[PDB]
Amino acid sequence: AVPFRRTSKAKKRKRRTHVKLQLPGMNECSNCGEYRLSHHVCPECGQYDGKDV
């Protein structure tokens, strides 16, 4: 329950190959022209589905 040998740099980086984070799922608001998340209310013009919220 305690490491027998220290971990080399190659093995550490190989383990960290999957420890990234993905890219946000966004597109452009039709009214704004600005970026926003899909299926969300855009924070700039405060509209969703062509109607003001």
Binding site: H39, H40, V41, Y48
Partner: protein, 122 residues
């Protein structure tokens, strides 16, 4: 149904509170699952108000919290959440069958990244 991180008595008290603020304010901001659960309760309550009996009124009063919405110059007596539910909210949806509420997603909270929404009855 879903357990919301709290036991049966605490969960029931959370649902009675949230279903009352939606009646009084008509628009509140909460989290995702916490909104997807009160969606059902508020609509069952509005159906009870739609019936409009005395049996229905008592059955709804067994769930509404007893708090004042606003005081009116009727002698100036206040009105309560049950009165508003049976006199204002329920007559609005006389010609509507279901779906008295909608949920609009907003985005994560700074403190803990919780996905917040807005639930509002129209």
């Amino acid at each position: 149904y879903r357990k919301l991180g709290r036991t049966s008595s605490q969960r029931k008290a959370l649902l009675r509170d949230l279903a009352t603020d939606l009646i009084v304010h008509e628009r509140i901001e909460t989290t995702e699952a916490r909104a997807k659960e009160i969606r059902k309760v508020v609509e069952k309550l509005i159906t009870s108000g739609k019936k409009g009996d005395l049996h229905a009124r008592r059955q709804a009063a067994a769930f509404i919290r007893h708090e004042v919405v606003e005081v009116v110059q009727v002698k100036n007596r206040p009105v309560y959440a049950l009165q508003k539910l049976f006199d204002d909210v329920a007559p609005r949806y006389a010609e509507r069958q279901g779906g008295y509420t909608r949920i609009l997603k907003k985005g994560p909270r700074r403190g803990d990244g919780a996905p917040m929404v807005i639930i509002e009855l129209v």
